[PDB]
Design an enzyme around this catalytic site. Structure first.
Site, PDB file in Angstrom:
ATOM      1  CE1 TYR A  27      -2.761  -3.353   1.410  1.00  0.00           C
ATOM      2  CE2 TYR A  27      -4.265  -1.719   0.501  1.00  0.00           C
ATOM      3  CZ  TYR A  27      -4.075  -3.131   0.671  1.00  0.00           C
ATOM      4  OH  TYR A  27      -4.860  -3.902   0.653  1.00  0.00           O
ATOM      5  N   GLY A  29       2.726   4.044  -1.753  1.00  0.00           N
ATOM      6  CA  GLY A  29       3.042   4.472  -2.860  1.00  0.00           C
ATOM      7  C   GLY A  29       1.967   4.276  -3.815  1.00  0.00           C
ATOM      8  N   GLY A  31       1.089   1.557  -5.051  1.00  0.00           N
ATOM      9  CA  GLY A  31       0.482   0.217  -4.779  1.00  0.00           C
ATOM     10  C   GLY A  31      -0.969   0.691  -4.103  1.00  0.00           C
ATOM     11  CG  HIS A  47      -2.473   7.797   3.405  1.00  0.00           C
ATOM     12  ND1 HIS A  47      -1.518   8.020   2.242  1.00  0.00           N
ATOM     13  CD2 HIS A  47      -2.351   9.016   4.091  1.00  0.00           C
ATOM     14  CE1 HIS A  47      -1.305   9.300   2.050  1.00  0.00           C
ATOM     15  NE2 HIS A  47      -1.894  10.060   2.897  1.00  0.00           N
ATOM     16  CG  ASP A  48      -2.879   3.754   0.108  1.00  0.00           C
ATOM     17  OD1 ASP A  48      -2.568   4.555  -0.231  1.00  0.00           O
ATOM     18  OD2 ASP A  48      -2.474   2.353  -0.027  1.00  0.00           O
ATOM     19  CE1 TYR A  51      -4.255  11.585   1.197  1.00  0.00           C
ATOM     20  CE2 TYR A  51      -3.181  10.901  -0.710  1.00  0.00           C
ATOM     21  CZ  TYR A  51      -3.165  11.811   0.254  1.00  0.00           C
ATOM     22  OH  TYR A  51      -2.159  12.556   0.597  1.00  0.00           O
ATOM     23  CE1 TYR A  67      -1.176  19.308   4.623  1.00  0.00           C
ATOM     24  CE2 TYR A  67      -2.417  17.761   3.030  1.00  0.00           C
ATOM     25  CZ  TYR A  67      -1.485  17.957   3.902  1.00  0.00           C
ATOM     26  OH  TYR A  67      -0.366  16.971   4.004  1.00  0.00           O
ATOM     27  CG  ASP A  93      -1.563  13.990   3.755  1.00  0.00           C
ATOM     28  OD1 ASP A  93      -2.016  12.739   3.292  1.00  0.00           O
ATOM     29  OD2 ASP A  93      -1.272  14.718   2.864  1.00  0.00           O
TER      30      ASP A  93
HETATM   31  C1  LIG Z   1       2.508  10.383  -6.990  1.00  0.00           C
HETATM   32  N1  LIG Z   1       2.584   9.870  -5.918  1.00  0.00           N
HETATM   33  C2  LIG Z   1       1.804   8.904  -5.273  1.00  0.00           C
HETATM   34  C3  LIG Z   1       1.303   7.916  -6.120  1.00  0.00           C
HETATM   35  C4  LIG Z   1       2.673   7.468  -6.670  1.00  0.00           C
HETATM   36  C5  LIG Z   1       3.525   8.731  -6.143  1.00  0.00           C
HETATM   37  C6  LIG Z   1       4.320   8.193  -4.700  1.00  0.00           C
HETATM   38  C7  LIG Z   1       3.268   7.967  -3.748  1.00  0.00           C
HETATM   39  O1  LIG Z   1       3.939   7.708  -2.566  1.00  0.00           O
HETATM   40  C8  LIG Z   1       3.087   7.344  -1.250  1.00  0.00           C
HETATM   41  O2  LIG Z   1       1.880   7.066  -1.428  1.00  0.00           O
HETATM   42  C9  LIG Z   1       3.523   7.267  -0.017  1.00  0.00           C
HETATM   43  C10 LIG Z   1       2.795   6.847   1.036  1.00  0.00           C
HETATM   44  O3  LIG Z   1       1.763   7.738   1.133  1.00  0.00           O
HETATM   45  C11 LIG Z   1       4.241   8.770   0.013  1.00  0.00           C
HETATM   46  C12 LIG Z   1       5.648   8.679   0.702  1.00  0.00           C
HETATM   47  C13 LIG Z   1       6.501   9.949   0.518  1.00  0.00           C
HETATM   48  C14 LIG Z   1       6.079  11.128  -0.225  1.00  0.00           C
HETATM   49  C15 LIG Z   1       4.697  11.092  -1.008  1.00  0.00           C
HETATM   50  C16 LIG Z   1       4.051   9.675  -0.636  1.00  0.00           C
HETATM   51  C17 LIG Z   1       1.833   8.610  -3.779  1.00  0.00           C
HETATM   52 CA   LIG Z   2      -1.084   3.542  -2.283  1.00  0.00          CA
END
Ligand SMILES: CN1[C@@H]2CC[C@H]1C[C@H](OC(=O)[C@H](CO)c1ccccc1)C2
Ligand SMILES: [Ca+2]
Length: 119
Positions: A27, A29, A31, A47-48, A51, A67, A93
């Site tokens: 999850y 990123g 994912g 978190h996902d 959102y 925000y 967040d």
């Molecule tokens: C555009 N960004 C999102 C979808 C692909 C990329 C990277 C992603 O990263 C994350 O989801 C993680 C966990 O929330 C995160 C970590 C560090 C910075 C931003 C996001 C969000």
């Molecule tokens: Ca994700």
């Protein structure tokens, strides 16, 4: 927005770069599916899901919505000058950044093969 989320993490977990959380488990990123692999991955699933809820709000785009928040002296705060979308996203967040700080990081779970391991 994602820049602000990066900064929440840099502020709550200064010991690790933020890219460490950008591609982790099922999850964290890009994912979004399967069994979360560990507690940190669970923080990302919540978190996902948070959102996806915020996206139900009209015009609300969690990766992009700017925000109002503060991070100082160990504390993160979503400010009162946030609309429903901004407040919801800022909350998602803030909760995730706090979660990340309390969760063990497992190098083995970085950059896992989503296609095979996250069905
Ligand atoms: C555009 N960004 C999102 C979808 C692909 C990329 C990277 C992603 O990263 C994350 O989801 C993680 C966990 O929330 C995160 C970590 C560090 C910075 C931003 C996001 C969000
Ligand atoms: Ca994700």
């Amino acid at each position: 927005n994602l820049y602000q989320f990066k900064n929440m993490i840099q502020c709550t977990v200064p010991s690790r770069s933020w890219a460490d959380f950008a591609d982790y488990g099922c999850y964290c990123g890009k994912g979004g599916s399967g069994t979360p692999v560990d507690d940190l991955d669970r923080c990302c699933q919540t978190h996902d899901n948070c959102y996806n809820e915020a996206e139900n709000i009209s015009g609300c785009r969690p990766y992009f919505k700017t925000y109002s928040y503060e991070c100082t002296q160990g504390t993160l705060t979503c400010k009162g000058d946030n609309n429903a979308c901004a407040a919801s996203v800022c909350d998602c967040d803030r909760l995730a950044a706090i979660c990340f700080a309390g969760a063990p990081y497992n190098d083995a779970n970085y950059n896992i093969d989503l296609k095979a391991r996250c069905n």
